[PDB]
Amino acid sequence: SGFRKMAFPSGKVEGCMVQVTCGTTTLNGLWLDDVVYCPRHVICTSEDMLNPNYEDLLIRKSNHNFLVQAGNVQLRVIGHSMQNCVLKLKVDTANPKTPKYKFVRIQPGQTFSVLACYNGSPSGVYQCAMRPNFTIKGSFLNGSCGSVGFNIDYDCVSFCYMHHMELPTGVHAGTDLEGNFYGPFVDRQTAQAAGTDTTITVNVLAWLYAAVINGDRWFLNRFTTTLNDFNLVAMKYNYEPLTQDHVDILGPLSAQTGIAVLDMCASLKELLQNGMNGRTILGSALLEDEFTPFDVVRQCSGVT
């Protein structure tokens, strides 16, 4: 028992990290097979970042301008291309440590692990959620660009995020591995609206189920609610409206605990209306929304 904000083991991803330098800019790249993926802003200087013309900036670069180093091994760049906000550097050597992998575009509310890197070297790993507004609340400093987010299913790494930038609000934005930003963001140093965020209701309910499984049950009550009634409360408290699709994905947790999804909704409704009254749930004094129902099941069953 016990419930922790657990990240996937990072080994398969550490084997793919490289350093990419172009001119005076250094950031991280991801080496999979004979391609290195990195944020296209590696080609910019600081003067360029207010409104870069990426196409023109890239035209001034040749394969030999992209210095790619895998630890201490220098990679030979034989091609380069820009795909949306990423650069793809073709190298002459396939990464011997390439795991089985997929590129996926995750949905808002889904979770993933981030391997934060600097200069091609891993510094740490943490789990987070893609906010409903497509930002992530990460831990990233200058030089972390090119660090990736991923999930692992057995031996397959699904890469879902590449870090690009920190918004003036201190939240983070990036792309899928095809270089498409999550959210409305652009890779320019301009103030950019993130838009209204909400709490991921289905994840809070999953985490309440994790709490009951792991012994914290003080919040259970004698009440029930309906989706309509619960959604009026979700509205008032800036929570995502709960749908039958969310109730369905909570089915396994509801079956395991014997607590009907709408009964757990009534516990959540009371917590929203009354607060925690100075108590905690799974070591937290707020309602946690960074665990999906799949994460709760995986953690509670011991999936490797």
Ligand X SMILES: Cn1cncc1NC(=O)Cc1cccc(Cl)c1
Strand pairing of 111-118 and 86-91?
unpaired
**Best CA proximity match to 65, nearest among 23, 28, 37, 19:** 23
Please, which residue, 214 or 224, has the CB nearer to its own copies?
A: 214
Q: Which stretch binds its own copies (CB under 8 A): 30-38, 55-63, 87-95, 281-289?
A: 281-289
Q: Which tokens in the block code for residue 229?
A: 């009634």
Distance CA 100, CA 104 (A): 13
165 binds, options its own copies, ligand X, none, Cβ within 5 to 8 A by partner type: ligand X
What residues between 202 and 221 interact with its own copies by CB under 8 A? 214-215
123 binds, options ligand X, its own copies, none, Cβ within 5 to 8 A by partner type: its own copies
- CB proximity list for 39: less than 8 A, separation 6 or greater: 27, 85, 86, 87, 145, 146, 162, 163, 164, 174, 175, 187
- CB proximity list for 67: less than 8 A, separation 6 or greater: 19, 20, 21, 22, 74
What residues between 49 and 78 interact with ligand X by CB under 6 A? 49
- Work out whether 276 is an interface residue with its own copies (CB under 8 A): yes
What residues between 5 and 64 interact with its own copies by CB under 8 A? 5-12, 14-15
Distance CA 105, CA 87 (A): 17
User: Judged by CB under 6 A, which of 127, 189, 192, 257 binds ligand X?
Assistant: 189
187 binds, options its own copies, ligand X, none, Cβ within 5 to 8 A by partner type: ligand X
- Work out whether 197 is an interface residue with its own copies (CB under 8 A): no
251 binds, options its own copies, ligand X, none, Cβ within 5 to 8 A by partner type: none
- Work out whether 145 is an interface residue with ligand X (CB under 6 A): yes
- Work out whether 144 is an interface residue with ligand X (CB under 6 A): yes
164 binds, options its own copies, ligand X, none, Cβ within 5 to 8 A by partner type: ligand X
Q: Which tokens in the block code for residue 123?
A: 């510094």
Total residues at interface with its own copies (CB under 8 A) = 55
In the chain, the N- to C-terminal Cα span, in Å, equals 16
Q: Which stretch binds ligand X (CB under 6 A): 186-194, 201-209, 217-225, 282-290?
A: 186-194
What residues between 154 and 173 interact with ligand X by CB under 6 A? 164-166
Q: Which tokens in the block code for residue 160?
A: 């879902």
- Beta strands across the sheet bearing 35-39: 73-75, 66-70, 17-22, 25-32, 35-39, 86-91, 77-83
Please, which residue, 27 or 266, has the CB nearer to ligand X?
A: 27
Residue recorded with tokens 């001119």: 23
